[PDB]
Amino acid sequence: SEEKANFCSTHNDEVYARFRLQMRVGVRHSPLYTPSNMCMLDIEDSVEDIEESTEKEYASTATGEAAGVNVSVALVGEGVSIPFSYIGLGFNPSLEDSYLYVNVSSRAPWVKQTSDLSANGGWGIKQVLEKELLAIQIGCDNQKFPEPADIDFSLLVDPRCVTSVDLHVELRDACIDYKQESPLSLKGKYGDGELVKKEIKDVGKNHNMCSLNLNPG
Amino acid sequence: TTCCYRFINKKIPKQRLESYRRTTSSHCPREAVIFKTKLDKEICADPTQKWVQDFMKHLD
Ligand SMILES: *[C@@H]1O[C@H](CO)[C@@H](O[C@@H]2O[C@H](CO)[C@@H](O[C@@H]3O[C@H](CO)[C@@H](O)[C@H](O)[C@@H]3O)[C@H](O)[C@H]2NC(C)=O)[C@H](O)[C@H]1NC(C)=O
Ligand SMILES: *[C@@H]1O[C@H](CO)[C@@H](O[C@@H]2O[C@H](CO)[C@@H](O)[C@H](O)[C@H]2NC(C)=O)[C@H](O)[C@H]1NC(C)=O
């Protein structure tokens, strides 16, 4: 990068979160499903309140629907926002059983500064390591059927349209490339993660591609 | 009806929660509890974690 470098350089002694998801979902259409290219994606954050505490619950949710299948990805900090800045699908508009690829990424601090989670002895890292919850879930839209660094997440799926799920997820120091280690390097997997990491990076030969990128600043 | 392929190893915030639901065996291989939220988000802890069974007792 031009900036990312200069930034990580000018910001040696603190840590900003970057969260990254990659997920291949195996799909199975309803016999009454009609092929379609439509894609709807959306990001929505929110700042609800931990009554007991003086500390706000932050939450970012990404969502996307394509090929009869809708996905929802929900990251919930106690006292820390990790804003999703972007989501991307790769999907196949046919009746064919097929794959659906879902990227989701946080903001780059060097686009817009996230919190330095290291401030005050790593207060933030406490908050994440201990508190942060992640909730993925997958459904079938409106289609009708004939009747410790272990990242802490929940996957619920409607199995009618969902054949398979593979994903690699990470919540890591947004400059770990320019650092030996970091106190924020959380990771998660489910089925061939390292595979779907490889594969997502180029499904754009054989799918429609839609995506949403939030305004920078 | 939906089915959980994974579980939260932490325990969810008491204040934030709302509804509860329990799986359909024939469908979902793992029996588990699905927790909605004030946020309208359905986290799901695989029970045996008493933390869950208590929360559900708070629900009931
Ligand atoms: C999810 O995120 C990944 C990582 O950013 C996306 O990877 C990008 O994928 C595109 C095509 O799918 C790649 O473009 C290709 O670059 C090669 C380089 O040899 C070029 O020869 C091809 O003609 C093509 O332009 C791009 O390299 C890749 N980006 C990076 C940084 O690796 C992926 O597309 C996303 N998946 C989605 C939205 O489903
Ligand atoms: C996929 O889409 C369906 C349809 O929109 C969603 O189901 C809705 O859930 C609400 C609960 O808040 C119910 O009132 C309805 O049953 C549904 N809405 C309708 C029929 O318009 C479901 O939330 C979606 N699942 C995911 C993961 O995005």
Characteristic terms for this protein:
heterodimer; A: 217 residues; mainly beta; 6-stranded antiparallel sheet; 5-stranded mixed sheet; 44% strand; B: 60 residues; alpha+beta; OB fold (Dihydrolipoamide Acetyltransferase, E2P); 17% helix; binds a molecule of 3 linked components (NAG-NAG-BMA); binds a molecule of 2 linked components (NAG-NAG)
Write the layout of secondary structure elements.
The complex is a heterodimer of chains A (217) and B (60).
Chain A: H1 3-10, E1 17-27, E2 39-49, E3 56-66, E4 69-78, E5 84-91, E6 98-106, H2 119-130, E7 133-139, E8 153-157, E9 162-173, E10 185-190, H3 193-200, E11 208-213
Parallel strand pairs in A: 7-8
Antiparallel strand pairs in A: 1-6, 1-9, 2-3, 3-4, 4-7, 5-6, 5-11, 9-10
Chain B: E1 3-4, E2 17-22, E3 33-37, E4 43-45, H1 50-59
Antiparallel strand pairs in B: 2-3, 3-4
The complex binds a molecule of 3 linked components (NAG-NAG-BMA) and a molecule of 2 linked components (NAG-NAG).
Glycosylation sites (chain A): 70
GO molecular function (chain A): identical protein binding
Pfam family, one (chain A): Orthopox_35kD
Description:
The complex is a heterodimer of chains A (217) and B (60). Chain A is mainly beta and 217 residues long. Chain A is built from 3 helices and 11 strands. In chain A, the strands form 2 sheets. In chain A, strands 10-9-1-6-5-11 form a 6-stranded antiparallel beta sheet, covered by helices on one side. A 5-stranded mixed beta sheet of chain A has the order 2-3-4-7-8, with no helix packed on it. The radius of gyration of chain A is 18 Å and the shape is globular. Chain B is of the alpha+beta class and 60 residues long. Chain B has one helix spanning 50-59, and strands at 3-4, 17-22, 33-37, 43-45. Classes of the chains: A mainly beta (217), B alpha+beta (60). Chains A and B meet through strand 3, strand 4, strand 7 and strand 8 of A and strand 1 and strand 4 of B. The complex binds a molecule of 3 linked components (NAG-NAG-BMA) and a molecule of 2 linked components (NAG-NAG). The site of a molecule of 2 linked components (NAG-NAG) has 8 residues of chain A, from strand 4 and strand 7. Chain A: Disulfide bonds join 8-175, 39-210, 140-161. Chain A: One of its GO terms (molecular function) is identical protein binding.
